[PDB]
Amino acid sequence: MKVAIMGAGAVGCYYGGMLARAGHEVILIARPQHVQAIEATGLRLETQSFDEQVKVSASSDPSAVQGADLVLFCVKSTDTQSAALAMKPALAKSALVLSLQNGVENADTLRSLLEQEVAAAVVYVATEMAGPGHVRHHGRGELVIEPTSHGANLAAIFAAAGVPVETSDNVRGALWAKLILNCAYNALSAITQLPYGRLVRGEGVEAVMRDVMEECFAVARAEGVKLPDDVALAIRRIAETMPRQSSSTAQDLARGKRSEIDHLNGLIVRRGDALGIPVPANRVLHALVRLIEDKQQH
Amino acid sequence: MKVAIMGAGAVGCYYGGMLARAGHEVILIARPQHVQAIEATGLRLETQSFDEQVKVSASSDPSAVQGADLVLFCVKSTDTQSAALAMKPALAKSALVLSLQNGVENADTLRSLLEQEVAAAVVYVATEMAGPGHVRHHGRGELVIEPTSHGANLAAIFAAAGVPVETSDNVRGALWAKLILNCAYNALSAITQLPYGRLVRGEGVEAVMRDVMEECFAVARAEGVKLPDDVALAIRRIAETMPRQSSSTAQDLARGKRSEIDHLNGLIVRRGDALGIPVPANRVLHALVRLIEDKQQHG
Numbered sequence: 241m242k243v244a245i246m247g248a249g250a251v252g253c254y255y256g257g258m259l260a261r262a263g264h265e266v267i268l269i270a271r272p273q274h275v276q277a278i279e280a281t282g283l284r285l286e287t288q289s290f291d292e293q294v295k296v297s298a299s300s301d302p303s304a305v306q307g308a309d310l311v312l313f314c315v316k317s318t319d320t321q322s323a324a325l326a327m328k329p330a331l332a333k334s335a336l337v338l339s340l341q342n343g344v345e346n347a348d349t350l351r352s353l354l355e356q357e358v359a360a361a362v363v364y365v366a367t368e369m370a371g372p373g374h375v376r377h378h379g380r381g382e383l384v385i386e387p388t389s390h391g392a393n394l395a396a397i398f399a400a401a402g403v404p405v406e407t408s409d410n411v412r413g414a415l416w417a418k419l420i421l422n423c424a425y426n427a428l429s430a431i432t433q434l435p436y437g438r439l440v441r442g443e444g445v446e447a448v449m450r451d452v453m454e455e456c457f458a459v460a461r462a463e464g465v466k467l468p469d470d471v472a473l474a475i476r477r478i479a480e481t482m483p484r485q486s487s488s489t490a491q492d493l494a495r496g497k498r499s500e501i502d503h504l505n506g507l508i509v510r511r512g513d514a515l516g517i518p519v520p521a522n523r524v525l526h527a528l529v530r531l532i533e534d535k536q537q538h
Numbered sequence: 539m540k541v542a543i544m545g546a547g548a549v550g551c552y553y554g555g556m557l558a559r560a561g562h563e564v565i566l567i568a569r570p571q572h573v574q575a576i577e578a579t580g581l582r583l584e585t586q587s588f589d590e591q592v593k594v595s596a597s598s599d600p601s602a603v604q605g606a607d608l609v610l611f612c613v614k615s616t617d618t619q620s621a622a623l624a625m626k627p628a629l630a631k632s633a634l635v636l637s638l639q640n641g642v643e644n645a646d647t648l649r650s651l652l653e654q655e656v657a658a659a660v661v662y663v664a665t666e667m668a669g670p671g672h673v674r675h676h677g678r679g680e681l682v683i684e685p686t687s688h689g690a691n692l693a694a695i696f697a698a699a700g701v702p703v704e705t706s707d708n709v710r711g712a713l714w715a716k717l718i719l720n721c722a723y724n725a726l727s728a729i730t731q732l733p734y735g736r737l738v739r740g741e742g743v744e745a746v747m748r749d750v751m752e753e754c755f756a757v758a759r760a761e762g763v764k765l766p767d768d769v770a771l772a773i774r775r776i777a778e779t780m781p782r783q784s785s786s787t788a789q790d791l792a793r794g795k796r797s798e799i800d801h802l803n804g805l806i807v808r809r810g811d812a813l814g815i816p817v818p819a820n821r822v823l824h825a826l827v828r829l830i831e832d833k834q835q836h837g
């Protein structure tokens with residue numbers, strides 16, 4: 241089983257590197273910075289358990305997906321279309337593309353562009369690029385995938401490599417739950433450059449999160465999404481279990497990078513407007529992140 | 539007539555400075571930073587028409603309001619109560635207290651604490667403290683005041699000093715119009731540190747402003763306020779007449795000072811909540827300015 245990782249960043253390197261450690265044939269399609277370090281001394285895979293250098297192929301040409309039976313597509317939502325179109329010509333016709341991304345539109349976007357079988361996955365992991373060719377795993381690293389033609393074979397192969405997997409007939413719901421969590425925290429954290437535990441103690445913040453969340457639940461209902469039963473409590477409890485954590489969006493803005501805000505609060509805005517559902521709290525958070533992003537850019 | 543300016547900052551020094559320049563006995567209750575500058579070289583009153591050093595009395599003791607017939611109360615809303623109680627025992631009983639402030643609760647707050655006649659005023663000016671003891675008037679400088687027992691005599695005295703004044707039976711609506719304008723621009727400008735003309739080009743910003751304003755207009759209606767007829771259009775046009783202007787709230791956050799946000803979007807939140815009217819856009823803007831302020835103070 242040949243595996244290609246399109247967009248070998250924090251997520252791609254962990255899952256890709258774990259499969260390489262298990263003995264599969266894996267090639268990471270990464271940026272020159274990382275390709276140069278992977279070809280020099282291999283992929284440094286630093287886990288909460290072990291720390292190793294892993295011999296994997298790496299390339300910056302999206303055609304290196306050639307011959308892969310399974311492509312883990314791990315770019316950010318903002319790059320879904322460009323990355324998919326870059327790899328489309330070389331992609332095997334029988335290849336299974338897994339979307340290891342956050343957001344609710346990636347699988348649909350991929351299927352609109354590609355004839356190959358696509359399956360959405362929900363990624364539960366904490367990872368970062370510690371430097372060139374270096375991935376650092378802070379915690380978790382499991383997956384929930386839609387049903388694929390590979391069946392239980394796909395989950396058996398991941399478990400055998402050190403990444404547990406569960407097939408679900410409601411990946412839509414899991415992806416939306418994660419989206420609403422991100423709508424509640426990411427923009428607030430990014431705009432103020434404060435961690436979740438500091439954030440929730442500001443005056444009015446619990447009531448802002450209520451407003452944001454009720455807007456999202458209204459959109460999820462209109463969209464026929466079945467969310468977990470205690471989703472609101474689970475969201476509120478994140479400030480307690482990750483008190484010193486700042487959001488990915490916060491880290492993007494601190495570093496002058498473009499965030500995924502168009503696929504977080506922006507999605508709720510676009511969707512709410514299309515459905516006649518007021519989304520004012522979500523709209524202020526989206527507009528504010530984009531204004532800050534645009535100042536940094538110009 | 540004897541006049542005291544309580545909270546001689548940008549507004550207090552301009553209006554007080556014109557009166558002192560016109561021959562009135564004016565005393566400025568300012569912070570020490572300024573008091574030492576005035577006691578040294580006098581108040582510098584720079585307009586786009588002239589530049590002058592004006593001999594005025596200044597002090598930091600709020601008891602200096604003693605024996606004033608007219609008190610111009612020009613502190614930020616955050617300080618109305620503390621400043622009002624500071625000057626309360628010293629204040630002449632027949633003194634007229636004019637609130638030259640922004641917000642819609644100052645005159646009521648003052649009347650709750652003081653027995654003296656209080657009149658709300660709407661301040662139309664652009665003024666800054668260019669440095670210690672130095673007031674820079676950028677434009678306008680007229681007042682619209684509620685009716686007073688002093689009647690037309692009050693407006694005739696101000697006009698004589700180069701300060702145009704009108705009396706209105708709807709200062710309420712004028713104060714609310716200014717509030718809604720500030721609810722639309724101040725927090726956005728402060729959170730992002732961008733001027734009005736840059737802000738309004740952002741993706742989704744016109745729609746945020748619509749949302750903020752509609753919440754404000756809903757609260758204003760439930761409160762029985764009569765606003766000017768084209769208030770929405772006048773607010774949107776500010777982005778084109780002051781394209782390079784950042785808000786007073788932006789300048790406060792840039793300098794690590796506490797803003798008046800509890801009396802801008804915070805008033806709308808508190809009132810909307812009390813009236814059962816959703817105020818989500820305003821609530822986000824208020825919470826965020828407060829979070830940023832709190833970080834700059836402790837952490």
Ligand SMILES: NC(=O)C1=CN([C@@H]2O[C@H](COP(=O)(O)OP(=O)(O)OC[C@H]3O[C@@H](n4cnc5c(N)ncnc54)[C@H](OP(=O)(O)O)[C@@H]3O)[C@@H](O)[C@H]2O)C=CC1
Binds near residue numbers: 323
């Ligand atoms: N990081 C985490 O712990 C979590 C992440 N997620 C989600 O998983 C997804 C990926 O996240 P993450 O790994 O952190 O993001 P990263 O940016 O770290 O990884 C993606 C990488 O793909 C690269 N890339 C984009 N286009 C191309 C291209 N055409 N050719 C080659 N490389 C390309 C990017 O380059 P460049 O650097 O220039 O953009 C980047 O290095 C996101 O949707 C994210 O929200 C979900 C759960 C956990």
Ligand SMILES: NC(=O)C1=CN([C@@H]2O[C@H](COP(=O)(O)OP(=O)(O)OC[C@H]3O[C@@H](n4cnc5c(N)ncnc54)[C@H](OP(=O)(O)O)[C@@H]3O)[C@@H](O)[C@H]2O)C=CC1
Binds near residue numbers: 617667
């Ligand atoms: N500036 C402008 O162009 C205009 C302002 N306004 C409104 O008018 C009001 C006044 O604003 P502005 O003049 O700009 O604000 P300023 O901060 O410049 O002026 C207030 C001054 O009073 C001082 N003060 C506060 N408490 C006391 C006290 N206990 N004893 C002595 N001094 C005290 C303040 O000290 P400290 O510096 O420590 O806070 C400050 O120096 C506001 O409500 C504002 O929104 C309306 C239209 C235009």
